[PDB]
Amino acid sequence: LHHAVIPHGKGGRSSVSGIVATVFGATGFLGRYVVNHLGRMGSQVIVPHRCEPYDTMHLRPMGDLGQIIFMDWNGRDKDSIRRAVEHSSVVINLVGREWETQNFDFEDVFVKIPQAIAQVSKEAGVEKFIHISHLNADIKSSSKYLRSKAVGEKEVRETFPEATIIKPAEIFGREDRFLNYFANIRWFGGVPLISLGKKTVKQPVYIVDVTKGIINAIKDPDARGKTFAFVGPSRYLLFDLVQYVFAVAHRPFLPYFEISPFEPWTTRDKVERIHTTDKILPHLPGLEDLGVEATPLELKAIEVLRRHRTYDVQPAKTIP
């Protein structure tokens, strides 16, 4: 490893790890844990961003002095991309959206932007790379989010053949938009409208589990070029989950919002992913391979929805 990146210290906050990580789209829900974990051990981190510098403030405590840098860039541009990746020991792409705008459609955020980043890393000779794909990727899939995603999984596997594409299932956490999606959006001011959520199988994963997986992947030398998917240890049915959620959230339940400016809620295409089944891929290595154990949704769902719980609950039945 380069002379300045040799490990030093005991891995605390001010200890030097040697991982010069450049995170793209770190402002998101997933990124802030990856940044925080990278910051935890003091690894140098560069954080390009598009929003106001104000929105990046919460990342600052996560890193020691001179370990967090807030550049600027634009997906449509590659000159900016090169600067942020010129001397990175690894590059992580976390871009993505749950809805389409009039600037960047699904393909742009899921195909070109993941690619454009990949090529420059190859051009710059980045030694490693990480890419977050979706478990249910398939060009013949219904959900344009997935169909757009499925394209990206190919170029990234081509432009950067050694990039460790990862395909996690639904993720949940304190700031997640999945468990918080059902509790508030589905019910608030509106009776549940589940369209016979009886066939779907959902196998979400805990955000911390994903975060630990990524870091372990960076360290591993043999993880180069492989492909992983992260899935919770217990499968579930869509209908069973929602009903159980209202038990933890203690909201009234009755089994069975358009697209606008701002950040839309309950989008047309988002529905397809809720109903879309979680693929079963026994052959792809998963979390257990990375020295990471899946944390059951029972243990950690308590904290996320504790805030939803205004002011002794049998755990949800599983489906094989």
């Binding site: 700031e175 918080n180 504790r306 805030r307």
Partner: protein
């Protein structure tokens, strides 16, 4: 009508500022926030009732200005002070009997 329309507008306007103030900041996407987290003391109830009884006797005084127009003034003047003194005694009773504990 006139008073009704005036009354309607006042509260009509009031709610809008309440609605707009409450709701319009909602559509501002300020991320999301985390979750934050009685002894019946005798002194406070005594004043509540004491106010009520003393207030009630006020209602008997309100006619006073109209009563002064009556040709039977000797009686009116006698009775008028009658209520006030009875009100005076009422307070006097509480004071001597230690009633005004909250005043302390």
């Amino acid at each position: 009508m006139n008073l009704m329309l005036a009354l309607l507008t006042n509260f009509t306007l009031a709610t809008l500022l309440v609605i707009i103030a409450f709701w319009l900041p909602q559509l501002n996407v300020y991320s999301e926030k985390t979750s934050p987290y009685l002894p019946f003391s005798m002194k406070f109830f005594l004043v509540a009732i004491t106010f009520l009884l003393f207030d009630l006797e006020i209602a008997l005084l309100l006619p006073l200005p109209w009563a002064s127009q009556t040709a039977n003034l000797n009686t009116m003047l006698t009775m008028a002070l009658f209520l006030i003194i009875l009100l005076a005694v009422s307070l006097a009773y509480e004071w001597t009997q230690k009633g005004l504990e909250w005043t302390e």
